[PDB]
Design an enzyme around this catalytic site. Structure first.
Site, short mmCIF file in Angstrom:
data_model
loop_
_atom_site.label_atom_id
_atom_site.label_comp_id
_atom_site.label_asym_id
_atom_site.label_seq_id
_atom_site.Cartn_x
_atom_site.Cartn_y
_atom_site.Cartn_z
N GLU A 314 0.82 -1.24 0.00
CA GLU A 314 0.00 0.00 0.00
C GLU A 314 0.84 1.27 0.00
O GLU A 314 0.59 2.21 -0.76
CB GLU A 314 -0.91 0.05 1.22
CG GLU A 314 -1.92 1.18 1.13
CD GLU A 314 -2.69 1.41 2.43
OE1 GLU A 314 -2.12 1.18 3.52
OE2 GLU A 314 -3.85 1.85 2.36
N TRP A 336 -8.20 -2.10 -0.01
CA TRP A 336 -9.05 -1.15 -0.69
C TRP A 336 -10.17 -1.78 -1.52
O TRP A 336 -10.89 -1.06 -2.23
CB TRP A 336 -8.21 -0.24 -1.59
CG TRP A 336 -7.39 0.72 -0.84
CD1 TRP A 336 -6.18 0.49 -0.31
CD2 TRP A 336 -7.72 2.08 -0.56
NE1 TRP A 336 -5.70 1.62 0.30
CE2 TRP A 336 -6.63 2.62 0.16
CE3 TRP A 336 -8.81 2.90 -0.86
CZ2 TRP A 336 -6.60 3.94 0.61
CZ3 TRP A 336 -8.80 4.20 -0.41
CH2 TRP A 336 -7.69 4.72 0.32
N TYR A 362 -4.83 9.31 -1.55
CA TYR A 362 -3.49 9.59 -0.99
C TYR A 362 -2.40 9.77 -2.03
O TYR A 362 -1.84 10.88 -2.18
CB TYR A 362 -3.07 8.49 -0.01
CG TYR A 362 -3.92 8.33 1.23
CD1 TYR A 362 -3.70 9.12 2.36
CD2 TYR A 362 -4.91 7.34 1.31
CE1 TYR A 362 -4.46 8.96 3.50
CE2 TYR A 362 -5.65 7.16 2.45
CZ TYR A 362 -5.41 7.97 3.55
OH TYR A 362 -6.19 7.84 4.68
N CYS A 422 -8.35 9.15 6.05
CA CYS A 422 -8.25 9.16 7.52
C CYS A 422 -6.94 9.81 8.00
O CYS A 422 -6.96 10.57 8.95
CB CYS A 422 -8.39 7.75 8.11
SG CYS A 422 -10.07 7.11 7.90
N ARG A 442 -7.86 11.67 11.60
CA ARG A 442 -9.15 12.24 11.95
C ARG A 442 -10.09 11.18 12.50
O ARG A 442 -11.00 11.48 13.25
CB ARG A 442 -9.80 12.98 10.75
CG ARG A 442 -10.27 12.07 9.62
CD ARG A 442 -11.26 12.68 8.60
NE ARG A 442 -11.44 11.65 7.58
CZ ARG A 442 -12.26 10.59 7.67
NH1 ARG A 442 -13.07 10.40 8.70
NH2 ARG A 442 -12.25 9.68 6.70
N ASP A 445 -10.04 3.69 14.07
CA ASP A 445 -10.64 2.43 14.44
C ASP A 445 -9.62 1.74 15.26
O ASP A 445 -8.67 1.15 14.75
CB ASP A 445 -11.06 1.64 13.18
CG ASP A 445 -11.49 0.23 13.49
OD1 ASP A 445 -11.50 -0.16 14.68
OD2 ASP A 445 -11.76 -0.52 12.52
O1 UMP Z 1 -6.22 3.71 7.78
C1 UMP Z 1 -7.37 3.73 8.27
C2 UMP Z 1 -8.48 3.84 7.43
C3 UMP Z 1 -9.74 3.83 8.01
N1 UMP Z 1 -9.89 3.76 9.36
C4 UMP Z 1 -11.26 3.70 9.93
C5 UMP Z 1 -11.77 4.89 10.73
C6 UMP Z 1 -13.27 4.61 10.63
O2 UMP Z 1 -13.61 3.53 11.53
C7 UMP Z 1 -13.46 4.16 9.18
C8 UMP Z 1 -13.63 5.27 8.15
O3 UMP Z 1 -14.86 5.91 8.41
P1 UMP Z 1 -15.12 7.46 8.33
O4 UMP Z 1 -14.39 8.05 9.53
O5 UMP Z 1 -14.61 7.89 7.01
O6 UMP Z 1 -16.61 7.54 8.52
O7 UMP Z 1 -12.24 3.53 8.87
C9 UMP Z 1 -8.74 3.63 10.18
O8 UMP Z 1 -8.79 3.52 11.42
N2 UMP Z 1 -7.54 3.62 9.60
#
Ligand code: UMP
Ligand code: NAP
Ligand code: NAP
Ligand code: 9QR
Ligand code: 9QR
Ligand code: UMP
Lengths: 536, 537
Positions: A314, A336, A362, A422, A442, A445
Site C-alpha cells: 500500500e 481497498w 493519498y 483518515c 481524523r 478504528d
Molecule cells: O487507515 C485507516 C483507514 C480507516 N480507518 C477507519 C476509521 C473509521 O472507523 C473508518 C472510516 O470511516 P469514516 O471516519 O470515514 O466515517 O475507517 C482507520 O482507522 N484507519
C-alpha cells in the site's frame, strides 16, 4: 501470624534470558509464550557476548539499598529467628557462575558474595567472600549478617533449586529479544505459582531489543496527601470489574504498547456511545497522542498477530502516485477492495467511475495535489504539486523549516475520492541528524485500523529518514475521533489482559537511497514475538 | 526543638473570598494582586447568595478525617503537653457567623463545633456546642478533645486575630471570581508569612468561575517502592539556573489549566533543542504536544500576563467573511497582518504583482472558497470553491456523529500565493450529548507570543460554532507540532512562569446571533478577567 522464609530474608532471583535456536518445523504456526525467553548460558559464558544495558541493570538492582528501610527488615528477621536486634546486598551464585568472571571484577563490588559450591574449601581461599555447600545453610548465613536484600544471581541449577523450594519472592527477568546458541536454560516458570506484575520500557542495546519484567510470588511531610484528597472533592459504557483483571493487576506498565492499550481502556471505561456512518455503533473519545521511539524498537503490536506485506505494498503504491485498486488486488492486497466495488462507488454517487478507480486519493495527492483527476490510467507526469518530492528536498536542504508537511486532505477533491482520507497529514521535524514524524488521524478504528496505521507511518518515517541520510527518532500519532466498534469489545477485553513482549526491529536494505526505489524485498521485520491472532 | 501551637494542634483557616465593589476612576486599567480576593461577608450573610461548589469543598475539607494518621497526632500532642496517654474535626467560628447559619444546619454536621463569644454563654445555646470566651481557651480545649484537625471557619474578626496570633498553619482559600457588595473583609495576607503552595483546577458554579488555593505558613505492609527505583536505572541542558524557576517549582500542586501552557514552556526551556529557524533569532523547540481546555468551566484567557482580544476577534470575523484584504483590519486599527502585507514582504515572497495588503488566498479564502482561483482581494468569489465553513455547520447540525467535520486551511496548491502559509492548519469537530468539542492542529507554534492568542481565537470560534448549531461548548483541544520558544522571549517567559495564575474569566456571546455570519464585535464580552501585568516579549 505465619510468614514465609523468602518474605523474611527477602530472597529474590535476577536473570536474563534470550531466545534459543530451534528446529523450524511449522514455523508459519509458531507459538510464543513466557518460556520463549529461557537462554541463560553457552560454553560457560553468556549466549550473547556483552549487553551493556542488561549489565547496568544487573549492577543497579544488586547494589541498591535504602538504609532508612533496613531497621524494619532487621527487626522482622531477628524477631523471626527469636534473637535480639556500609549496608550491602547478598548475591548468591553457583560455582560455574563464580568461575566465569574476570579477575578484576571478583568479588562483586559493593555486594556480599556467596558461592554455593560442594567441592570448594573456605581455608585455601585467596579472596574475601563467604561459602556454603547447602541451600539450608544460606538462611543460617543471612541470620548472622546485616544485609538489605538477597539476590540469587545465577546458575541454571541454582535457580532451579531455589524455585522448587519456594525460596524466591520475585524474579527480576531481562527478556533479550534475539536468538543465540545455548547450553543451559532457566526453568519453566509455573503460571499458578508466579505472576507478572510489572513491565518496563523497551530498549535497544548491542543490536537487540530487550525489556525487563518482574514476576511476583502468588498467594492463593507525607501528611500533605490530605491536600490531594481535597483536590478530588468534586470527582465521584457498561463495563464489569473483573473484565480487566490481569490488566489492572499490573503495577507498572511502561512498555510502549500500553499507550495503545490504555487508550482502549479509556474508551471502554469512559467512551461516549454513538451511532456512526457504518450503523454498527461505537464507544468514542476525541483527542489523544501516542509516541513511539523508533531509535529503540519497531512498534508492531505484540498482544496480537500483525501482518505487514499488505501495508508495505500500500505504501509503495502511495509513493508511486497510484489510484488503481487493481494493482493492489493483483498482489492479493485487499485493503481497498470494498471501497472500489460498483456498489460502494455508486453509494458515493460516483456513477461514472470504473470499479477499483479510487479517485484522487493519498497517492494522487502526495504526487499531484491540485491536478485535475480524470481516470486511473491517465498520465499525470509533472502535473500538480509533488508534495513528496518537496518534503524530501526540505528535509535535505532546510531541515529546520516548520513547513515540512505532506497533506492528503484535498478539500476540492474529497467528493471525487472513493472515501476521504483518515490520515490527514504528516509533519516532519529534524534535529541533530534525527527525523521525527507527526501523523494526524481524523478517524481511528482502534481495534482494527490503528495497529496497522502505527506500523505504516513508522515504516514510512524509516524510509524518509534513510533516503535523507538521517536516523529515525519519534513517530508521534495524534488521534482525533478515536473509537472502538461494539463488535470489537470482546476481542479487545481478551487483548488488554495480555502482556506485551519486547518489540521487533525493522531492517531496510541500506542500498536504497531514493524514496521511489523501495521494493517489497527491501523490508525485514526481525525478532517479532507476539501473542495469538485475534479476529475482530 | 520548640514547637508551634498551630503545628501541634493542626490549626488551619478556611475561607471563601470574592472581589469587592471599588471606584470607577481607574477601571480601564485595573491592577490585580492576591488581595483582589478579599470579600468575606455582607449584612451578616455571604456577599454572593449561594455557591454550591464552594459549599461542597468547605464540607469536604472540614469533615474529612484519616483515622490511620490520628495515632501519630495523638502522640505528638500528648508529647507536647508531657502526657503518655467516629473521629471528627473541630470547627471554630465567631458568634456572628454561628448566627448566620440556618437552624437546620446547626450545629455543623459530623464536626465538633466551637463558638467564640463574650456576650453569650452555654445557657444561651440549646445545641451540642462548646463556647469559649477567649482564644487561649481553644488551645486548652484542644488538649482535652480527641479530634483530627481544627479549622477556623471565620468571622472576619476570628480570621484576623488568629492570623495576628500566628495560630494558622495553612489557609484553604476559595477565590470567587465575581464582584459583590461587601462590608467585611479577609485580612491582607503577609507575603513574608504565607506563600501559595497549591492551585486547583478552575470551575464554574452559580454563574461565576472560582478556584481553590492553599497558602502555607512560611519558615520566617506494601512496598514496591524499590521496583520504581529499578525501572529508573537509565537516566541523566540550556544554561538554566535553579533560582530561575524558584516560585514555579515551589508549588506542590499545579492543577490550574494555565499550567498546561506554562508547563510546555518549562519543558521546552529545560529539554528543548537549540535550533536556527527561518527568522534568524533561533529557538528552543520540541515536537508534539496536546493541551485541553474545558470551555464549559472557564474561558482560557491566560492570566499570567495581560491579553486583549479585540484584534483576534476582528481577525476571526474577517476570516468568516472570507476576506483577504488587509486594509479592512487596518481600518479597525488591528495590525496583526500589517507586516505580512507590505510591498517589501510581498516582493520577498515573489508576489511582485500583488497589491499592498492583498494577502492572497489565506485562511478566510480557504474557509469560504477552497479550490477557487485567487485573482485579487476585491473580486467577487460568490459560489466559487468549496464553502467549508457552511459545510461543517451543516454537518454539525445534520450529521453530528460524522468523523469528517474538518475545516482545512492548508491548501497545498495555493501556498506560494499566500503572503505566508497558515500555522493553524485544521479544526476537527466532535459532537456528543448536545455538546461541541474542537481540535485545532497547529504546525508551528510561537509559545511566547502566538500560542496565547491562538488558544483564545479557537476557544471563541468553538463557542460561535456551538451557539449557531444549538450546542453547548465542551473542550477546545490544541495540538502543537513544532513548538518553539524564541531566544529573545526567554527572559520574559522566566518572569511569567513564576507568576501564579488567577481564576479564569468567562466569555459571553449575544444569544440572539443564530448564524455564523451575523456576529459583530459588540456580540462578545469577556467578564471577570483578572490578570498579572502585561509582559512585552
Ligand atoms: O487507515 C485507516 C483507514 C480507516 N480507518 C477507519 C476509521 C473509521 O472507523 C473508518 C472510516 O470511516 P469514516 O471516519 O470515514 O466515517 O475507517 C482507520 O482507522 N484507519
Ligand atoms: N542471568 C544469566 O543469564 C546468567 C547468570 C549467571 C550465569 N549464567 C551462565 O550460566 C552458566 C552457568 O550455569 P550452570 O547452572 O551450568 O552453573 P552454576 O549453577 O553456576 O554452577 C553449578 C555448580 O554450583 C554448585 N551447586 C549447584 N546446586 C547446588 C546445591 N544444591 N548444593 C551445593 N552446591 C550446588 C555445584 O558446584 P560443585 O561443582 O562445587 O559441586 C554445581 O556443580 C554459564 O554459562 C554462565 O555464563 C547466566
Ligand atoms: N466568606 C467566608 O469565608 C465567611 C466565613 C464565615 C463568615 N462569613 C461572613 O462573615 C460575617 C461575620 O463576620 P464578623 O467579623 O462580622 O463576625 P465573626 O468574626 O464571626 O464574629 C465576631 C464575634 O465573635 C466573638 N469573638 C471573636 N473573637 C473573640 C474572642 N477572642 N473572644 C471572645 N469572643 C470573640 C465576639 O462575639 P460577641 O459579640 O458574642 O462577644 C464577636 O463579636 C458574616 O457576613 C458571615 O456571613 C464569611
Ligand atoms: C549480566 C548478566 C545478568 N543479567 C541479569 N539481569 N541477571 C543476572 N543474574 C546476570 O548474570 C550475572 C552473572 C555474572 O556474569 C558476568 C557477566 C559479565 C561480566 C563482565 C565481563 N565479562 N567483562 C567485563 N568487562 N565486565 C563484566 C561485569 C562484571 C562478569 C560477570
Ligand atoms: C460556605 C462558605 C465558606 N466557604 C469556605 N471555603 N470557607 C468558609 N469558612 C465558609 O464559610 C463557612 C461559614 C458559613 O457557613 C455556612 C453554613 C451553612 C450554609 C448553608 C446555607 N445557608 N443554606 C443551605 N441550603 N445549605 C448550607 C450548607 C449546609 C451556608 C454557610
Ligand atoms: O497564529 C499564529 C501565526 C504565526 N505564529 C508563529 C509561529 C512561527 O514562529 C511563525 C510562522 O513562521 P513559520 O513557521 O511559517 O516559519 O509565526 C503563531 O504561533 N501563531
Amino acid at each position: 501470624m505465619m510468614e514465609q522464609v523468602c518474605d523474611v530474608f527477602d530472597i529474590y532471583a535476577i536473570c536474563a534470558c534470550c531466545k534459543v535456536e530451534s528446529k523450524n518445523e511449522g514455523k508459519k504456526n509458531e507459538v510464543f509464550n513466557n518460556y520463549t525467553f529461557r537462554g541463560l548460558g553457552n560454553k560457560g559464558v553468556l549466549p550473547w557476548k556483552c549487553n551493556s544495558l542488561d549489565m547496568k541493570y544487573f549492577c543497579a538492582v544488586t547494589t541498591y539499598v535504602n538504609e532508612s528501610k533496613y531497621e524494619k527488615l532487621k527487626y522482622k528477621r531477628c524477631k523471626y529467628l527469636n534473637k535480639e536486634t556500609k549496608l550491602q546486598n547478598v548475591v548468591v551464585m553457583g560455582r560455574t557462575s563464580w568461575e566465569s568472571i574476570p579477575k578484576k571484577f571478583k568479588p562483586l563490588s559493593n555486594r556480599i558474595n556467596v558461592i554455593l559450591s560442594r567441592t570448594l574449601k573456605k581455608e585455601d581461599f585467596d579472596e574475601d567472600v563467604y561459602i556454603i555447600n547447602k541451600v539450608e545453610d544460606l538462611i543460617v548465613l543471612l541470620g548472622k549478617l546485616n544485609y538489605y536484600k538477597c539476590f540469587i544471581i545465577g546458575g541454571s541449577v541454582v535457580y532451579q533449586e531455589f524455585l522448587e523450594k519456594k525460596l524466591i519472592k520475585k524474579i527480576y527477568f531481562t527478556r533479550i529479544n534475539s536468538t543465540y546458541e545455548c547450553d543451559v536454560f532457566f526453568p519453566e516458570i509455573n503460571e499458578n505459582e508466579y505472576q507478572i506484575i510489572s513491565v518496563s520500557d523497551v530498549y535497544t542495546s548491542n543490536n537487540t531489543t530487550l525489556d525487563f519484567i518482574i514476576y511476583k510470588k502468588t498467594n492463593n511531610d507525607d501528611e500533605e496527601e490530605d491536600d490531594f484528597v481535597y483536590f478530588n472533592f468534586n470527582k465521584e459504557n457498561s463495563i464489569h470489574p473483573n473484565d480487566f483483571q490481569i490488566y489492572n493487576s499490573l503495577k507498572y506498565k511502561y512498555h510502549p504498547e500500553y499507550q495503545y492499550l490504555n487508550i482502549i481502556y479509556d474508551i471502554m471505561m469512559n467512551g461516549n456511545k454513538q451511532s456512526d456512518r457504518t450503523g454498527v455503533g461505537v464507544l468514542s473519545k476525541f483527542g489523544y497522542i501516542m509516541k513511539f521511539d523508533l531509535s529503540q524498537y519497531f512498534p508492531l503490536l505484540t498482544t496480537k498477530k500483525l501482518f505487514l506485506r499488505g501495508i508495505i505494498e500500500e505504501l509503495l503504491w502511495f509513493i508511486r502516485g497510484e489510484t488503481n485498486g487493481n494493482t493492489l488486488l493483483n498482489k492479493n492486497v485487499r485493503i481497498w477492495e470494498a471501497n472500489g466495488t460498483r456498489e460502494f462507488l455508486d453509494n458515493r454517487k460516483l456513477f461514472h467511475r470504473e470499479v477499483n478507480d479510487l479517485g484522487p486519493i493519498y497517492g494522487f495527492q502526495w504526487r499531484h495535489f491540485g491536478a485535475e483527476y480524470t481516470n486511473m490510467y491517465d498520465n499525470y507526469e509533472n502535473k500538480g504539486v509533488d508534495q513528496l518530492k518537496n518534503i524530501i528536498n526540505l528535509i535535505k536542504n532546510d531541515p529546520t523549516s516548520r513547513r515540512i508537511l505532506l497533506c492528503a486532505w484535498n478539500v476540492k477533491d474529497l467528493d471525487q475520492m472513493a472515501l476521504p482520507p483518515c490520515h490527514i497529514l504528516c509533519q516532519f521535524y529534524v534535529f541533530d541528524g534525527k527525523l521525527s514524524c507527526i501523523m494526524y488521524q481524523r478517524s481511528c478504528d482502534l481495534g482494527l485500523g490503528v495497529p496497522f496505521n502505527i506500523a505504516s507511518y513508522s515504516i514510512f518515517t524509516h524510509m524518509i529518514a534513510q533516503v535523507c541520510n538521517l536516523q529515525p527518532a519519534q513517530f508521534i500519532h495524534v488521534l482525533g475521533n478515536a473509537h472502538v466498534y461494539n463488535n470489537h469489545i470482546d476481542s479487545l477485553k481478551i487483548q488488554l489482559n495480555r502482556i506485551p513482549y519486547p518489540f521487533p526491529t525493522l531492517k531496510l536494505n541500506p542500498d536504497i537511497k531514493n524514496i521511489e526505489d523501495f521494493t517489497i524485498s527491501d523490508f525485514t521485520i526481525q525478532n517479532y514475538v507476539h501473542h495469538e491472532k485475534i479476529s475482530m
